[PDB]
Amino acid sequence: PRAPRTYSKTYSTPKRPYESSRLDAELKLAGEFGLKNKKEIYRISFQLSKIRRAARDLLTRDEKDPKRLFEGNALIRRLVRVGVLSEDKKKLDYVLALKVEDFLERRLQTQVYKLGLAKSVHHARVLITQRHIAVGKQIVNIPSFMVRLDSEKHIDFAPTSPFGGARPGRVARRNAARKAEASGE
Amino acid sequence: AKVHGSLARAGKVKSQTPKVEKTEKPKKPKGRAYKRLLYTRRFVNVTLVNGKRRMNPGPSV
Amino acid sequence: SVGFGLVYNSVAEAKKFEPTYRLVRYGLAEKVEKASRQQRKQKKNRDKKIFGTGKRLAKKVARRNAD
Amino acid sequence: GKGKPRGLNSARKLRVHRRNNRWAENNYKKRLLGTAFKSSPFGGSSHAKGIVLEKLGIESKQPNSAIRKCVRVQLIKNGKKVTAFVPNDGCLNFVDENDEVLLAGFGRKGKAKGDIPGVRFKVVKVSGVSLLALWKEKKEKPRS
RNA sequence: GGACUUUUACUUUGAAAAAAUUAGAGUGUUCAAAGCAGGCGUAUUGCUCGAAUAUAUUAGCAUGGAAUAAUAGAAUAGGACG
RNA sequence: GGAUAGUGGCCUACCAUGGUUUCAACGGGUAACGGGGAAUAAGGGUUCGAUUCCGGAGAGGGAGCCUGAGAAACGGCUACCACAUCCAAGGAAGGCAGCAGGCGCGCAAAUUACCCAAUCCUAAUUCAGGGAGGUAGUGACAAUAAAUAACGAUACAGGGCCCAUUCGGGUCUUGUAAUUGGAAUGAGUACAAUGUAAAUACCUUAACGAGGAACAAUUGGAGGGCAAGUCUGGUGCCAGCAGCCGCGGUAAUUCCAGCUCCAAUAGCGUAUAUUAAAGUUGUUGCAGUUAAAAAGCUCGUAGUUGAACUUUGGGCCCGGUUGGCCG
Ligand SMILES: [Mg+2]
Ligand SMILES: [Mg+2]
Ligand SMILES: [Mg+2]
Ligand SMILES: [Mg+2]
Ligand SMILES: [Mg+2]
Ligand SMILES: [Mg+2]
Ligand SMILES: [Mg+2]
Ligand SMILES: [Mg+2]
Ligand SMILES: [Mg+2]
Ligand SMILES: [Mg+2]
Ligand SMILES: [Mg+2]
Ligand SMILES: [Mg+2]
Ligand SMILES: [Mg+2]
Ligand SMILES: [Mg+2]
Ligand SMILES: [Mg+2]
Ligand SMILES: [Mg+2]
Ligand SMILES: [Mg+2]
Ligand SMILES: [Mg+2]
Ligand SMILES: [Mg+2]
Ligand SMILES: [Mg+2]
Ligand SMILES: [Mg+2]
Ligand SMILES: [Mg+2]
Ligand SMILES: [Mg+2]
Ligand SMILES: [Mg+2]
Ligand SMILES: [Mg+2]
Ligand SMILES: [Mg+2]
Ligand SMILES: [Mg+2]
Ligand SMILES: [Mg+2]
Ligand SMILES: [Mg+2]
Ligand SMILES: [Mg+2]
Ligand SMILES: [Mg+2]
Ligand SMILES: [Mg+2]
Ligand SMILES: [Mg+2]
Ligand SMILES: [Mg+2]
Ligand SMILES: [Mg+2]
Ligand SMILES: [Mg+2]
Ligand SMILES: [Mg+2]
Ligand SMILES: [Mg+2]
Ligand SMILES: [Mg+2]
Ligand SMILES: [Mg+2]
Ligand SMILES: [Mg+2]
Ligand SMILES: [Mg+2]
Ligand SMILES: [Mg+2]
Ligand SMILES: [Mg+2]
C-alpha cells in the first residue's frame, strides 16, 4: 500500500520489420554515430514522434493561444538548449521538419569525437564508459548524455585516469614494475 | 484418417545423418563492435556486386 | 561526499536529543543486549498464560510430583 | 435513404440493432457464450498438462503422404482426452506411454494445422523438461 | 431600482469538483526511467525560486443566447385591459 | 399505534386496491464487487480493470448476541451445519481471505529471516507496543541506463588530384591478415571508510583482475509473404518441415547437418487472450439484381420521422480585438 512507482518505455519498434531500405539506413546511422543496436536508433525515433506530436497539436491551435505560446516556446527553448534546434530555426513549423540525426548529433558519444579527444566514434564510446571524460566536475559514462549548448566547452579528460594526469593506469604501472624487478637486479 | 499407421520409422533421417563436428573459428565481436563490422563491410569497401550487391553468394557464381 | 551534520551546545543536550543509534556509533551510549524479537515475543505469550505472581503457581507445581 | 434510422432520437434503435448484429461476429459470439470454458479441451487456458494414453501414427492429408507421430493425452484438469502432435524428428521416442506431457495449441485459433487432420495441440515437455531440451541434448529425460 | 424562460430541448460562460495516473511547466537523478526536488554565497551561525498549469460534463447547480425543434393560448367567447 | 437514534409498510391493527412493465418490467446468465483507472494510439471507437487510492462486502457456512460512543466483531461469545485437534474415553479445545510456512489445486505466483531507525497508529502515553510499516532474501512480471573491446606497425591488394615513353610511383588514404606494438577498463576480488537500527548492495577507493581453448551472446530464420544460399553432404512422398501458399518419390534454394548469411540482441522464441490492421459490425462508415442478404401481399399499434408562415428592414451613440508607423 506504498505509492506506486511510475515508469514508461523509452522506445518504439517499426511497423514493418523487414524493409531493406529502412534496415540499410538504420545500419548507416549505427556506423556513423557508433551506435550499439537498433534500440538506440529506436529510442530517438520515439523522442521525435512525441515532440512532433505535441507540435502538431500546438499548430492546430490558434496563434496567440496562451497554451500554444506557453508550451510552444518551452518546447523550442529546450530543443535549443541541447543544440538540437538551430540558433534560429526557432518557429514550431521547423521542429516538425527536425529529424533524428539532429538529436543523434548531440550525443556525448558524438561530441567526444566531434572535438578531438577520440579520433573515432568507437574510440569515443570505450573512452566514455571507461570513466575518462568529464563535463565540468562530473564524470559521465553514459554515451547518450546529449551534450547541451553551454556545457559543450567543459568537456575534457577527467581529474582521474592517466589521460587527465594523476597516475597512469594499472596496465602501464604493471609494465613499469616488470622492467624494475627483473633486469634492474 | 487412419490413426494406426506405423510408428516404426520415427527418427529415421536424423539418426542416419552423418554427424559432423563444427569447425573452430575466431569469436565474432558482440555489441557495438559487431554492428561496426556490418557497416564497414556491408557498405564501405563494396567488395561484392554483380549490380545486385550480393550478401551471401554461393561459391564461384 | 555530501551528508548532514549537527552541533549541539552542551554535550549533555546532545545526549538527550540524539537518536540513540548514533550515541553507540560515538561510544556515547552502551549497546544494549536483548533477546531477539522472536524470542522476546514468545516470552510475552508464555507470560500471558499466567495470571498473577508467578512463584505462587510454582508452589502449585511443587505441591504435585512429590507423589 | 441508407436504410438505417437517422433520427436524433433513434439512438436506442441504433444501439440495439448493433447489439443484435454483433452475434454474427465470430469472436464476439464465442467470447459471450463462454465457448472457451465450455466446449474447449483446454479450459480456455494457454496450456494444459495430461498423461499419454497411446501413440498414434496419423497419416497426413493429400497431396502430402507421411505418418505424423502423435500422442493421445488425457488432461489432468478435465480428464478430457485429446490427440496432440509431437514436433521435429523422432521426438516420438522421447515420449512414452503414461508420460504426463505439457500441451499447447497449434496457433491456428483452434483450427487444425497443415496436413495433420484433427490434431489441435502439440507436445511441449515430457516429464517436466522440454522437447527442445531433449532433442538438442541440452538435457536428459528424467530417469523414472 | 429589484423581479417574465407558457413549458422544454439545444448552445455559451462559470462554480462545485481528491491524490495517484494521463497531458504538460520548471529542475543535469552523471544520461535515463524516475523523483520534487533545489539554486546562490563568504560556507561563521546565512540568503532564496519552487512543489504550475491543462484536462470528464453523463447528470445536478449557476449563467449569457433565442436560430433550429417542440410546446401553451380568445371560437357556443365562460377572452383581455379598466 | 409500536418500535428505532431517528424517517419510513421497519412492524402491528384497521381501511382501501393499488404498484412495475416493449421507453423491456419480471426472470435467467455473468469465467460481475463499483469507481479512480489500463491496453490499443487519424478520428470515431474496441477490450480490460481480482490487484497500491476511495467506497463496498466477508472472515469455513448461517444465524444469534454480549461489551461499548461505535461491532450484528469473528486473532469476542452462543448455537446449528461442515470440518477438525488433544485425552487416562471422564472430558477439553479451534477458525491464516493477517505475516511467514505446509498440503491440495493447477499453465500459473517468493523466506517458517531482521527491525521499530523511517512512515504513521494506539495507550495512562516523548519511553511501551505495532508481521501496520520498513530492512534484507527469492524474483528475466514489467521498466531505465547499456561492457562483451579501443588505437597504432609490417606485408599484398586497393580505389589512388599525381608524377606517365616503359612498376619512371606525388603525397595521402580504405579495407586485409597463421604478423607484431603497447595503451584503457570494469565483470569480479578486496584493506578501509562510506552506507545501515545492525548488516547487505549501490556510490568512493588502496592492493589485485584481458590475449583467445577468456571475462568465448544469445535466440529465431535464409522458396514466397519476408531481411538472408541454387553451397556441400545425408534422406529418398520415408524421416521430417510448413501460421498461410507450399516442400520431400536419388541432381530438395523448404527436411537432418557443415559452411555461409539475415533479423533482433541480454534478450529471443512458442501458446492463449486482446487491440490495431477491419469501412470484415459500418454514428462517423459497409453490404443486400446475379457474390451472404428485400418479409408472397396489404393493413396496422408501439418507435422513428414529419411542408410553409407570425420582427424583418432602416437610422444614430458608446467603447473593445488584431492590424503599418516611430524608439
Ligand atoms: Mg509524468
Ligand atoms: Mg443500402
Ligand atoms: Mg447516421
Ligand atoms: Mg501422395
Ligand atoms: Mg492444402
Ligand atoms: Mg516535465
Ligand atoms: Mg527527468
Ligand atoms: Mg442538459
Ligand atoms: Mg418546421
Ligand atoms: Mg408512524
Ligand atoms: Mg421509524
Ligand atoms: Mg402507515
Ligand atoms: Mg463472482
Ligand atoms: Mg476511460
Ligand atoms: Mg482506424
Ligand atoms: Mg476493482
Ligand atoms: Mg476471482
Ligand atoms: Mg493480490
Ligand atoms: Mg465486517
Ligand atoms: Mg479460507
Ligand atoms: Mg477484525
Ligand atoms: Mg461473525
Ligand atoms: Mg486469525
Ligand atoms: Mg505441480
Ligand atoms: Mg511467473
Ligand atoms: Mg508451486
Ligand atoms: Mg517507528
Ligand atoms: Mg517505540
Ligand atoms: Mg529487465
Ligand atoms: Mg588489502
Ligand atoms: Mg547495484
Ligand atoms: Mg585490468
Ligand atoms: Mg582478451
Ligand atoms: Mg529477400
Ligand atoms: Mg528450419
Ligand atoms: Mg543433396
Ligand atoms: Mg538448411
Ligand atoms: Mg475497428
Ligand atoms: Mg457523427
Ligand atoms: Mg462486406
Ligand atoms: Mg446462386
Ligand atoms: Mg443471392
Ligand atoms: Mg410481421
Ligand atoms: Mg419464403
Curated annotation (Swiss-Prot), chain A:
Keywords: Cytoplasm, Isopeptide bond, Nucleus, Phosphoprotein, Ribonucleoprotein, Ribosomal protein, Ribosome biogenesis, RNA-binding, rRNA processing, rRNA-binding, Ubl conjugation. There is a cross-link at residue 179 (Glycyl lysine isopeptide (Lys-Gly) (interchain with G-Cter in ubiquitin)). It comes from the Eukaryota. The keyword Cell membrane does not apply. The modification Phosphoserine is found at residue 183. Coiled coil: none annotated. Residues 106-180 form the S4 RNA-binding domain. Its main location: cytoplasm. This is Small ribosomal subunit protein uS4A. Belongs to the universal ribosomal protein uS4 family. GO terms for biological process: maturation of SSU-rRNA from tricistronic rRNA transcript (SSU-rRNA, 5.8S rRNA, LSU-rRNA); ribosomal small subunit biogenesis; translation. Residues 159-185 are annotated as: Disordered. CDD domains: S4. One of its GO terms (molecular function) is rRNA binding. Component of the ribosome, a large ribonucleoprotein complex responsible for the synthesis of proteins in the cell. The small ribosomal subunit (SSU) binds messenger RNAs (mRNAs) and translates the encoded message by selecting cognate aminoacyl-transfer RNA (tRNA) molecules. The large subunit (LSU) contains the ribosomal catalytic site termed the peptidyl transferase center (PTC), which catalyzes the formation of peptide bonds, thereby polymerizing the amino acids delivered by tRNAs into a polypeptide chain. GO terms for cellular component: 90S preribosome; cytoplasm; cytosol; cytosolic small ribosomal subunit; nucleolus; nucleoplasm; small-subunit processome. Present with 106000 molecules/cell in log phase SD medium. It is found in: Cytoplasm; Nucleus, Nucleolus.
UniProtKB/Swiss-Prot annotation, chain B:
Belongs to the eukaryotic ribosomal protein eS30 family. The keyword Ribonucleoprotein applies. This is Small ribosomal subunit protein eS30A. It comes from Saccharomyces cerevisiae (strain ATCC 204508 / S288c). InterPro entries: Ribosomal_eS30. It is found in: Cytoplasm. Keywords: Cytoplasm, Phosphoprotein, Ribonucleoprotein, Ribosomal protein. Residues 1-34 are annotated as: Disordered. Present with 37600 molecules/cell in log phase SD medium. There are 2 genes for eS30 in yeast. Component of the small ribosomal subunit (SSU). Mature yeast ribosomes consist of a small (40S) and a large (60S) subunit. The 40S small subunit contains 1 molecule of ribosomal RNA (18S rRNA) and 33 different proteins (encoded by 57 genes). The large 60S subunit contains 3 rRNA molecules (25S, 5.8S and 5S rRNA) and 46 different proteins (encoded by 81 genes). One of its GO terms (molecular function) is structural constituent of ribosome. GO terms for biological process: cytoplasmic translation. One of its GO terms (cellular component) is cytoplasmic stress granule. It comes from the Eukaryota. The modification Phosphoserine is found at residue 15.
Swiss-Prot record, chain C:
There are 2 genes for eS24 in yeast. The gene is RPS24A. Signal peptide: none annotated. Component of the ribosome, a large ribonucleoprotein complex responsible for the synthesis of proteins in the cell. The small ribosomal subunit (SSU) binds messenger RNAs (mRNAs) and translates the encoded message by selecting cognate aminoacyl-transfer RNA (tRNA) molecules. The large subunit (LSU) contains the ribosomal catalytic site termed the peptidyl transferase center (PTC), which catalyzes the formation of peptide bonds, thereby polymerizing the amino acids delivered by tRNAs into a polypeptide chain. Disulfide bonds: none annotated. It is found in: Cytoplasm. Residues 34-67 are annotated as: Disordered. Belongs to the eukaryotic ribosomal protein eS24 family. N-terminally acetylated by acetyltransferase NatA. Also partially acetylated by NatC. Residues 37-47, 56-67 have a biased composition (Basic residues). Component of the small ribosomal subunit (SSU). Mature yeast ribosomes consist of a small (40S) and a large (60S) subunit. The 40S small subunit contains 1 molecule of ribosomal RNA (18S rRNA) and 33 different proteins (encoded by 57 genes). The large 60S subunit contains 3 rRNA molecules (25S, 5.8S and 5S rRNA) and 46 different proteins (encoded by 81 genes). Coiled coil: none annotated. This is Small ribosomal subunit protein eS24A. It comes from the Eukaryota. The chain holds residues 69 to 135 of 135 of the full protein. It comes from Saccharomyces cerevisiae (strain ATCC 204508 / S288c) (Baker's yeast).
Swiss-Prot record, chain D:
The modification 3,4-dihydroxyproline is found at residue 63. Hydroxylation at Pro-63 affects translation termination efficiency. The stereochemistry of the 3,4-dihydroxyproline has not yet been determined. InterPro entries: NA-bd_OB-fold, Ribosomal_uS12, Ribosomal_uS12_euk/arc. It comes from Saccharomyces cerevisiae (strain ATCC 204508 / S288c). Changing residue 63 to A: Lethal mutation. Gene3D superfamilies: Nucleic acid-binding proteins. Changing residue 64 to A: Lethal mutation. GO terms for biological process: maintenance of translational fidelity; maturation of SSU-rRNA from tricistronic rRNA transcript (SSU-rRNA, 5.8S rRNA, LSU-rRNA); regulation of translational fidelity; translation. This is Small ribosomal subunit protein uS12A. Keywords: Cytoplasm, Hydroxylation, Isopeptide bond, Ribonucleoprotein, Ribosomal protein, Ubl conjugation.
